[PDB]
Design an enzyme around this catalytic site. Structure first.
Site, PDB file in Angstrom:
ATOM      1  NE  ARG A  56      -8.522 -10.323   5.268  1.00  0.00           N
ATOM      2  CZ  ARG A  56      -9.625 -10.364   4.508  1.00  0.00           C
ATOM      3  NH1 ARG A  56      -9.805 -11.329   3.628  1.00  0.00           N
ATOM      4  NH2 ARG A  56     -10.503  -9.384   4.697  1.00  0.00           N
ATOM      5  CE1 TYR A  72      -3.269  -2.940   7.879  1.00  0.00           C
ATOM      6  CE2 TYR A  72      -3.521  -1.027   6.492  1.00  0.00           C
ATOM      7  CZ  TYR A  72      -3.957  -2.249   6.896  1.00  0.00           C
ATOM      8  OH  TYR A  72      -5.120  -2.804   6.346  1.00  0.00           O
ATOM      9  CE1 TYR A  76      -3.013  -5.821   3.717  1.00  0.00           C
ATOM     10  CE2 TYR A  76      -1.925  -4.303   5.196  1.00  0.00           C
ATOM     11  CZ  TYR A  76      -2.697  -5.422   5.003  1.00  0.00           C
ATOM     12  OH  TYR A  76      -3.112  -6.141   6.110  1.00  0.00           O
TER      13      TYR A  76
END
Ligand code: FE
Ligand code: MG
Lengths: 211, 197
Positions: A56, A72, A76
């Protein structure tokens, strides 16, 4: 970290791109999209190289304009790659050679994090609490809309977890704390400029103080 | 230019490069990412939360367990898992509508809701539903009357939530399978109310 990722309450966005029960398509909309989560779990559970909280935080550490234009799952990919380089497992050079081109990563952390607080209180359901008026430049699981605000405890978890502000930096002093469902009236968080009723934030013990 | 994007290789090439860099060093077990892709696609599913809702709707004892110890209730079905180890179910009532978000990222009860949809992870939802949930739900197709409190749960720690929607009229006597069919993913996130034909 008061980064652009702390989006609750920001004004100026348009419609949510969905109407109820519309087709959302397959779980993955491209053939690479399962790799960021999968390689996150390899890093956490197989390599033992970082925690989910560190994922995170590394996504929070994307340069802010980079965050805002990146889909999104690509955030990551960038975050897990960044952690693998930071932890010494991979180099940026080898990632760019394999990729055939630039692979910019998240920015270095500007905070070493902080320990689980030494003095806290066990709160009971129904008690009034205030969110500590503290600024944390590293990882924290407190959205700024509730900083300094007062709410009531709806729940104290029966499990405890390491304090994010420490484990999100890979520190050895994260301890363990329960979290609390803290119910805030909408007017406490946004004055007259809300159409809601209440908001419940799940806050670590170390973020709270008696009201 | 000012505020311009950094140069980057195509995202597919970057994502597979990350895979190859790690796999080439023996750090990724055989079939490991394929294993996760199958879990994410086939096991984690809102059909599980639908099953839980239908059970609650027809079994007051289970409904009470689900609302007081959601983890234990979910475990009876074997549906605990990654991002769904501590479960709290929140019940809608005639004067209360619950809605879930992760304003800071995308946190979702994966095993019983499925991985979050693109819209739930959007900046629009993340920014707006905490401050104007009535307008967001309205735009999404769900009207919530003035006399109903809306309560937004922001998933900021390890609690993973599911909404228990009200059972709609006109379903009296339905079987668990019939009831499961009208509890959709959006019902479990809280932005939709179950619909009866
Ligand atoms: Fe999240
Ligand atoms: Mg801010």
């Amino acid at each position: 970290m008061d980064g652009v990722h702390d989006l609750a309450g920001v004004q100026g966005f348009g419609k949510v791109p969905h109407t109820v029960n519309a087709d959302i398509g397959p779980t993955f909309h491209a053939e690479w999209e399962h790799l960021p989560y999968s390689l996150m779990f390899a890093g956490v559970a197989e390599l033992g190289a970082f925690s989910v909280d560190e994922v995170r935080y590394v996504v929070e550490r994307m340069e802010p304009r980079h965050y805002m234009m990146t889909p999104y799952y690509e955030r990551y990919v960038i975050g897990v790659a960044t952690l693998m380089v930071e932890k010494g497992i991979l180099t940026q050079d080898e990632l760019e050679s394999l990729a055939g081109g630039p692979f910019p990563l998240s920015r270095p952390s500007e905070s070493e994090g902080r320990p689980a607080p030494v003095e806290t209180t066990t709160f009971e359901v129904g008690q009034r609490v205030r969110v500590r008026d503290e600024y944390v430049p590293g990882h924290i699981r407190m959205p700024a809309y509730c900083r300094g605000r007062v709410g009531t405890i709806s729940h104290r978890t029966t499990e405890k977890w390491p304090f994010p502000d420490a484990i999100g930096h890979g520190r050895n002093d994260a301890g363990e704390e329960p979290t609390y469902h803290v119910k805030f009236a909408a007017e406490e968080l946004f004055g007259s400029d809300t159409d809601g009723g209440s908001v419940v934030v799940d806050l670590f013990e170390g973020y709270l103080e008696p009201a | 230019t000012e505020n311009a994007a950094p140069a980057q290789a195509p995202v597919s090439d970057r994502a597979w490069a990350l895979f190859r860099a790690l796999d080439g060093k023996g750090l990724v077990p055989d079939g490991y990412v394929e294993g996760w892709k199958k879990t994410f696609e086939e096991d984690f599913s809102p059909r599980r939360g639908a099953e839980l809702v239908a059970r609650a709707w027809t079994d007051p004892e289970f409904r009470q367990l689900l609302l007081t110890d959601g983890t234990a209730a979910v475990a009876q079905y074997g549906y605990l898992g990654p991002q769904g180890e501590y479960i709290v179910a929140v019940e809608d009532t005639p004067t209360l509508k619950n809605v879930i978000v992760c304003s800071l990222c995308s946190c979702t009860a994966w095993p019983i809701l499925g991985l979050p949809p693109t819209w739930y992870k959007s900046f629009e939802y993340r920014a707006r539903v905490v401050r104007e949930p009535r307008k967001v739900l309205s735009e999404m197709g769900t009207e919530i009357a003035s006399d109903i409190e809306i309560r937004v749960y922001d998933t900021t720690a390890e609690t993973r939530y599911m909404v228990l929607p009200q059972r709609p009229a006109g379903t009296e006597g339905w079987s668990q399978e019939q009831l499961q069919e009208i509890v959709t993913k959006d019902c479990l996130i809280g932005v939709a109310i179950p619909q009866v034909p």
